[PDB]
PDB file of C-alpha atoms and ligand atoms in Angstrom:
ATOM      1  CA  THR A   7       0.000   0.000   0.000  1.00 47.75           C
ATOM      2  CA  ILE A   8       1.257   3.360  -1.079  1.00 47.94           C
ATOM      3  CA  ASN A   9      -1.851   5.413  -0.181  1.00 48.46           C
ATOM      4  CA  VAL A  10      -5.450   4.958   1.246  1.00 50.76           C
ATOM      5  CA  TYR A  11      -8.269   7.339   0.346  1.00 50.80           C
ATOM      6  CA  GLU A  12     -11.662   7.436   2.011  1.00 47.45           C
ATOM      7  CA  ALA A  13     -14.568   7.854  -0.387  1.00 46.37           C
ATOM      8  CA  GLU A  14     -15.954  10.584   1.927  1.00 45.08           C
ATOM      9  CA  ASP A  15     -12.642  12.481   2.035  1.00 43.17           C
ATOM     10  CA  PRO A  16     -13.592  16.173   1.745  1.00 42.45           C
ATOM     11  CA  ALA A  17     -10.997  16.601  -1.018  1.00 40.10           C
ATOM     12  CA  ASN A  18     -13.152  14.452  -3.299  1.00 40.28           C
ATOM     13  CA  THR A  19     -15.824  15.664  -5.722  1.00 40.75           C
ATOM     14  CA  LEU A  20     -19.345  14.289  -5.522  1.00 44.23           C
ATOM     15  CA  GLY A  21     -21.603  15.053  -8.463  1.00 45.61           C
ATOM     16  CA  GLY A  22     -25.330  15.111  -8.566  1.00 45.88           C
ATOM     17  CA  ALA A  23     -27.113  12.770  -6.229  1.00 49.09           C
ATOM     18  CA  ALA A  24     -23.959  11.051  -4.927  1.00 48.40           C
ATOM     19  CA  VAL A  25     -23.794  11.614  -1.180  1.00 46.44           C
ATOM     20  CA  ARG A  26     -21.658  10.988   1.927  1.00 48.61           C
ATOM     21  CA  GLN A  27     -23.525   8.935   4.487  1.00 52.16           C
ATOM     22  CA  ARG A  28     -22.669   7.599   7.951  1.00 52.94           C
ATOM     23  CA  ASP A  29     -22.219   3.908   8.717  1.00 50.86           C
ATOM     24  CA  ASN A  30     -20.405   2.753  11.830  1.00 51.74           C
ATOM     25  CA  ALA A  31     -19.512  -0.444   9.967  1.00 49.97           C
ATOM     26  CA  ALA A  32     -17.565   1.550   7.301  1.00 48.53           C
ATOM     27  CA  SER A  33     -13.974   2.715   7.378  1.00 51.67           C
ATOM     28  CA  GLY A  34     -13.904   6.173   8.873  1.00 50.94           C
ATOM     29  CA  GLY A  35     -17.564   5.787   9.765  1.00 51.00           C
ATOM     30  CA  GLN A  36     -18.783   6.952   6.375  1.00 52.49           C
ATOM     31  CA  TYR A  37     -19.224   5.864   2.745  1.00 50.66           C
ATOM     32  CA  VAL A  38     -20.487   7.368  -0.506  1.00 53.41           C
ATOM     33  CA  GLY A  39     -23.834   6.173  -1.859  1.00 55.68           C
ATOM     34  CA  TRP A  40     -26.225   6.849  -4.715  1.00 56.32           C
ATOM     35  CA  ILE A  41     -23.503   6.573  -7.328  1.00 58.64           C
ATOM     36  CA  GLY A  42     -25.323   5.853 -10.579  1.00 57.33           C
ATOM     37  CA  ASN A  43     -28.604   6.376 -12.435  1.00 59.47           C
ATOM     38  CA  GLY A  44     -26.778   8.794 -14.716  1.00 58.10           C
ATOM     39  CA  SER A  45     -23.212   9.917 -15.206  1.00 62.01           C
ATOM     40  CA  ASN A  46     -23.761  13.180 -13.368  1.00 62.91           C
ATOM     41  CA  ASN A  47     -24.118  11.251 -10.066  1.00 67.63           C
ATOM     42  CA  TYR A  48     -20.440  10.435  -9.633  1.00 68.61           C
ATOM     43  CA  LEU A  49     -17.675  10.078  -7.056  1.00 66.55           C
ATOM     44  CA  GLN A  50     -14.284  11.431  -8.003  1.00 62.28           C
ATOM     45  CA  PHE A  51     -11.131  10.865  -6.024  1.00 60.36           C
ATOM     46  CA  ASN A  52      -8.917  13.790  -6.469  1.00 61.31           C
ATOM     47  CA  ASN A  53      -5.196  13.781  -5.949  1.00 58.09           C
ATOM     48  CA  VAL A  54      -4.415  10.122  -5.914  1.00 57.36           C
ATOM     49  CA  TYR A  55      -0.651  10.413  -5.732  1.00 54.00           C
ATOM     50  CA  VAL A  56       1.979   7.979  -6.936  1.00 51.99           C
ATOM     51  CA  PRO A  57       5.685   8.606  -7.541  1.00 51.44           C
ATOM     52  CA  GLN A  58       5.978   6.566 -10.748  1.00 51.51           C
ATOM     53  CA  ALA A  59       4.029   6.101 -13.929  1.00 55.35           C
ATOM     54  CA  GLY A  60       2.693   2.559 -14.216  1.00 52.95           C
ATOM     55  CA  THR A  61      -0.023   0.079 -13.517  1.00 53.23           C
ATOM     56  CA  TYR A  62      -1.158  -0.141  -9.915  1.00 55.16           C
ATOM     57  CA  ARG A  63      -3.614  -2.302  -8.059  1.00 56.25           C
ATOM     58  CA  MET A  64      -6.571  -0.343  -6.742  1.00 55.92           C
ATOM     59  CA  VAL A  65      -8.234  -2.134  -3.875  1.00 55.90           C
ATOM     60  CA  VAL A  66     -11.848  -0.962  -3.629  1.00 54.77           C
ATOM     61  CA  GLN A  67     -13.781  -1.463  -0.403  1.00 56.67           C
ATOM     62  CA  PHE A  68     -17.494  -1.500  -1.123  1.00 54.01           C
ATOM     63  CA  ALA A  69     -20.980  -2.735  -0.216  1.00 54.02           C
ATOM     64  CA  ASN A  70     -23.558  -4.193  -2.584  1.00 55.62           C
ATOM     65  CA  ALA A  71     -26.773  -5.948  -1.426  1.00 58.15           C
ATOM     66  CA  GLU A  72     -28.870  -5.489  -4.549  1.00 54.94           C
ATOM     67  CA  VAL A  73     -31.369  -8.209  -5.416  1.00 53.39           C
ATOM     68  CA  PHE A  74     -33.444  -8.848  -8.574  1.00 54.60           C
ATOM     69  CA  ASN A  82     -31.499 -13.619  -5.906  1.00 58.82           C
ATOM     70  CA  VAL A  83     -28.355 -11.495  -5.530  1.00 63.02           C
ATOM     71  CA  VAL A  84     -26.841  -9.498  -8.346  1.00 66.09           C
ATOM     72  CA  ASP A  85     -23.656  -7.747  -9.277  1.00 67.01           C
ATOM     73  CA  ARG A  86     -23.519  -3.955  -9.495  1.00 66.34           C
ATOM     74  CA  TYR A  87     -21.684  -2.415 -12.419  1.00 66.02           C
ATOM     75  CA  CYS A  88     -19.404   0.551 -12.164  1.00 69.88           C
ATOM     76  CA  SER A  89     -17.522   2.611 -14.732  1.00 71.65           C
ATOM     77  CA  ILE A  90     -14.040   3.740 -13.641  1.00 70.86           C
ATOM     78  CA  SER A  91     -12.284   6.619 -15.419  1.00 68.99           C
ATOM     79  CA  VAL A  92      -8.707   7.501 -14.635  1.00 67.27           C
ATOM     80  CA  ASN A  93      -7.580  11.060 -15.423  1.00 69.05           C
ATOM     81  CA  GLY A  94     -10.668  11.564 -17.551  1.00 69.07           C
ATOM     82  CA  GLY A  95      -9.759   8.521 -19.580  1.00 66.42           C
ATOM     83  CA  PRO A  96     -11.985   5.923 -21.159  1.00 67.70           C
ATOM     84  CA  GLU A  97     -14.189   3.930 -18.763  1.00 66.44           C
ATOM     85  CA  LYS A  98     -13.161   0.582 -17.570  1.00 66.57           C
ATOM     86  CA  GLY A  99     -16.210  -1.355 -16.461  1.00 68.17           C
ATOM     87  CA  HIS A 100     -16.184  -3.576 -13.391  1.00 69.56           C
ATOM     88  CA  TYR A 101     -18.838  -5.920 -12.049  1.00 68.61           C
ATOM     89  CA  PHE A 102     -18.830  -5.869  -8.270  1.00 70.55           C
ATOM     90  CA  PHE A 103     -19.963  -8.974  -6.407  1.00 65.96           C
ATOM     91  CA  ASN A 104     -22.713  -8.999  -3.839  1.00 69.09           C
ATOM     92  CA  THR A 105     -21.774  -8.460  -0.176  1.00 66.37           C
ATOM     93  CA  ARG A 106     -25.331  -9.466   0.895  1.00 65.32           C
ATOM     94  CA  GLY A 107     -25.677  -6.531   3.272  1.00 66.75           C
ATOM     95  CA  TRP A 108     -25.511  -2.774   2.911  1.00 67.55           C
ATOM     96  CA  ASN A 109     -23.339  -2.625   6.021  1.00 65.89           C
ATOM     97  CA  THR A 110     -21.083  -5.478   4.901  1.00 66.71           C
ATOM     98  CA  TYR A 111     -17.948  -4.145   3.238  1.00 67.77           C
ATOM     99  CA  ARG A 112     -15.639  -6.328   1.182  1.00 65.19           C
ATOM    100  CA  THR A 113     -12.819  -5.662  -1.297  1.00 61.94           C
ATOM    101  CA  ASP A 114     -12.019  -6.247  -4.938  1.00 61.30           C
ATOM    102  CA  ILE A 115      -9.048  -5.276  -7.063  1.00 63.48           C
ATOM    103  CA  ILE A 116      -8.986  -3.282 -10.238  1.00 60.76           C
ATOM    104  CA  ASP A 117      -5.820  -2.496 -12.166  1.00 65.86           C
ATOM    105  CA  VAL A 118      -5.327   1.165 -13.054  1.00 66.08           C
ATOM    106  CA  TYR A 119      -2.684   3.012 -15.082  1.00 73.05           C
ATOM    107  CA  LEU A 120      -1.487   6.107 -13.256  1.00 77.20           C
ATOM    108  CA  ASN A 121       0.854   8.963 -14.090  1.00 76.52           C
ATOM    109  CA  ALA A 122       3.616  10.151 -11.759  1.00 78.02           C
ATOM    110  CA  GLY A 123       2.107  12.796  -9.473  1.00 77.02           C
ATOM    111  CA  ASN A 124      -1.553  13.485  -8.805  1.00 75.10           C
ATOM    112  CA  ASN A 125      -4.275  11.517 -10.563  1.00 73.52           C
ATOM    113  CA  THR A 126      -8.077  11.490 -10.601  1.00 74.58           C
ATOM    114  CA  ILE A 127     -10.230   8.411 -10.382  1.00 74.78           C
ATOM    115  CA  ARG A 128     -13.996   8.688 -11.083  1.00 78.33           C
ATOM    116  CA  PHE A 129     -16.631   6.110 -10.304  1.00 77.66           C
ATOM    117  CA  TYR A 130     -20.002   6.389 -12.039  1.00 77.05           C
ATOM    118  CA  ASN A 131     -22.778   4.485 -13.735  1.00 79.80           C
ATOM    119  CA  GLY A 132     -24.468   6.235 -16.654  1.00 81.33           C
ATOM    120  CA  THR A 133     -27.303   3.793 -17.147  1.00 82.32           C
ATOM    121  CA  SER A 134     -30.700   5.009 -15.936  1.00 80.16           C
ATOM    122  CA  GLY A 135     -31.808   2.907 -12.950  1.00 81.72           C
ATOM    123  CA  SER A 136     -28.376   1.243 -12.617  1.00 83.95           C
ATOM    124  CA  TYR A 137     -26.145   1.887  -9.606  1.00 82.61           C
ATOM    125  CA  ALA A 138     -22.545   1.333  -8.649  1.00 85.42           C
ATOM    126  CA  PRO A 139     -21.851  -0.285  -5.310  1.00 84.45           C
ATOM    127  CA  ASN A 140     -21.559   1.979  -2.290  1.00 88.26           C
ATOM    128  CA  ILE A 141     -17.870   2.924  -1.974  1.00 89.18           C
ATOM    129  CA  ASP A 142     -16.165   3.035   1.432  1.00 89.48           C
ATOM    130  CA  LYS A 143     -12.529   3.691   0.478  1.00 91.96           C
ATOM    131  CA  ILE A 144      -9.798   2.775  -1.992  1.00 91.56           C
ATOM    132  CA  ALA A 145      -6.175   1.818  -1.570  1.00 91.50           C
ATOM    133  CA  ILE A 146      -3.404   1.995  -4.110  1.00 90.65           C
ATOM    134  CA  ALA A 147      -0.695  -0.660  -4.075  1.00 89.05           C
ATOM    135  CA  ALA A 148       2.429  -0.737  -6.330  1.00 90.27           C
TER     136      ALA A 148
HETATM  137 CA1   CA B 201     -15.132   5.370   4.400  1.00 89.20          CA
HETATM  138 MG1   MG B 202     -11.212  -9.735  -8.165  1.00 89.91          MG
END
């Protein structure tokens, strides 16, 4: 681990309906919800800093208890305004149950942005607790 960033960090940008909410079960006692149902309802991590250009592992801590019978939640991930990389996040079976999954990201030396969104009407990303970047 080279850096951890809480979703609710006040440095971050929340668009639209995305919102910081309290959960004692979450890291830092908060998470970001209502990411999705249109690309304007986004979470952007600002100033994700690494010393070297390259591919890193981004460990995402999240909750997803959607049912249709559990289902995955899709999220689009854009690095530095780049093209979306889609990820299907498994079901944690409870909205207060936070697990992790890994997504590879290409970062520049210095500060980077990472945006989480889902542009599909009625479709939501998981709730995001925090991310960690590992070299
Ligand atoms: Ca958190
Ligand atoms: Mg995985």
